[PDB]
């Protein structure tokens, strides 16, 4: 029944042009094995693209756009056909004109197009789509806001290369409101969009902070759905790659207790991201290392260092080692780490097969030794207490073996540790 339909679509009669477009849209909607390939190869896309112009019925525009959208939401190559037919500008101009059914189709289309690659994403933006899309978040129609938010997040996605910041950043004010939505899918997608926007340079982070997002994100770290937790946690973590002032805004918003909650998530990857996130706060100044300790985060962090999956342990080791930095100017910190039992797990981690981490681990152990030494020299004892803890945990042997590591810096720090504290 198909070469016939191709001819009924080419009829100059408006009455039949519709009937045909309607039959195309229907077969293109079959849930099972849609005929997107066959319909494309019958040559009719550029004809459907014409049916979406200003100079066409409201009911024909709809059906042509819905048919095309079913095409554009298939495979990367079937999306490509629709883009190559110059369909995007008319999808975009239908966001202004069309009714609400129509707006929902075009916004979905542009979402699928924007999601195919960083090229198509940039291209949608170049076609000045941002402006109309934002115009949709007045509609107060739940399903259209939901869709507009999905698309919007795809416009923000991708780091290599970033999208054009001066355009996508105009969406911050709208997102800031959207993370207050009671529609789970909206909320989720708004959080993704923020996680992408916040993933960038200090200018981008500050934009996120200035619209007041971070208060709400911190609230969302305790949402019932891990679908919300994950991207929210990520945005917050990106914010704390920033400077001390930026990091301080998130702590001030209450992130440390939320992080406590997340260090006992059932999902391993939430725990891994929380460890990472805390590690970039213990990378911060001396007040912030103390805030981490005061929020009772060290003990679960230590427990993850002993028993968690490898990727999670590495992140926890960063969190604990970065914290020992500040032990040279506040020795209570190191004392508390030691006393929470972090020596045996740090030691046992030295045999991980990752030179990045072995190095961090030895920096943590050196800092513990340096403070264990300045402890006994300050009050005239004949023993480094921490040196003996490391020894009794089989960590001297383990540090010793690090001299046989190919990286010169590892060997050098390890050599230095055995001489200075095990001579």
């Amino acid at each position: 029944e198909l070469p016939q339909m191709t001819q009924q679509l080419n009829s100059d009669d408006m009455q039949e042009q519709l009937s045909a477009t309607v039959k195309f849209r229907q077969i293109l909607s079959r849930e099972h094995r849609p005929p997107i390939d066959v319909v494309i190869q019958a040559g009719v896309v550029p004809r459907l693209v014409e049916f979406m112009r200003e100079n066409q019925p409201e009911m024909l525009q709809l059906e042509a756009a819905w048919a095309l959208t079913n095409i554009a939401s298939g495979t990367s190559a079937q999306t490509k056909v629709v883009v190559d037919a110059d369909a995007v500008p008319l999808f975009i101009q239908l966001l202004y004109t069309g009714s609400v059914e129509v707006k929902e189709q075009a916004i979905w289309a542009l979402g699928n197009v924007a999601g195919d690659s960083t090229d198509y994403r940039d291209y949608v933006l170049q076609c000045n789509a941002m402006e109309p899309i934002l115009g949709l978040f007045n509609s107060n129609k739940p399903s259209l806001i939901r869709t507009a938010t999905w698309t919007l997040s795809n416009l923000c996605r991708g780091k290599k290369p970033q999208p054009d910041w001066s355009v996508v950043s105009q969406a911050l004010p709208t997102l800031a409101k959207l993370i207050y939505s009671m529609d789970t899918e909206t909320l989720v997608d708004a959080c993704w969009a923020i996680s992408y926007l916040s993933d960038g340079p200090q200018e981008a982070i500050q934009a996120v902070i200035d619209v007041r997002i971070p208060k709400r994100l911190v609230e969302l770290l305790s949402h019932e759905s891990t679908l919300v937790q994950t991207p929210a946690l990520r945005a917050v973590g990106n914010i704390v790659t920033g400077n001390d002032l930026q990091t301080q805004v998130v702590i001030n918003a209450g992130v440390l207790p939320a992080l406590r909650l997340l260090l006992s998530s059932p999902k391993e990857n939430i725990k891994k991201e929380a460890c990472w996130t805390i590690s970039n706060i213990t990378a911060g100044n001396t007040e912030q290392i103390q805030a981490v300790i005061d929020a009772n985060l060290i003990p679960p962090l230590v427990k993850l260092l002993e028993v968690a999956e490898d990727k999670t342990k590495k992140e926890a080791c960063w969190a604990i080692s970065n914290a020992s930095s500040g032990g040279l100017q506040r020795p209570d910190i190191i004392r508390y780490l030691v006393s929470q039992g972090c020596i045996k797990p740090l030691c046992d981690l030295l045999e991980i097969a990752d030179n990045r981490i072995i190095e961090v681990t030895l920096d943590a152990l050196e800092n513990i030794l340096k403070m264990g030494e300045a402890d006994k020299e300050a009050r005239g004892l004949n023993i480094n207490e921490n040196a003996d803890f490391i020894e009794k945990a089989g960590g001297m042997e383990k540090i010793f073996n690090c001299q046989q590591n190919e990286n010169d810096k590892i060997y050098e720090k390890a050599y230095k540790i055995i001489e200075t504290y095990f001579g």
């Binding site: 989720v188 891990t226 970065n322 060997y411």
Partner: protein
């Protein structure tokens, strides 16, 4: 001191649920001994 994440995680793809030294460079290197 701060660490950016290994990669940017994303909605569509996120799912939540080494060499020793040569011999060349091991007699030519100074291995400090403990005491024990």
């Amino acid at each position: 001191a701060k660490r950016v994440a290994d990669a940017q995680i994303q909605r569509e793809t996120y799912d939540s649920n080494t060499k020793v030294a040569s011999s060349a460079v091991m007699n030519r290197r100074k291995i400090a001994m403990p005491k024990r």
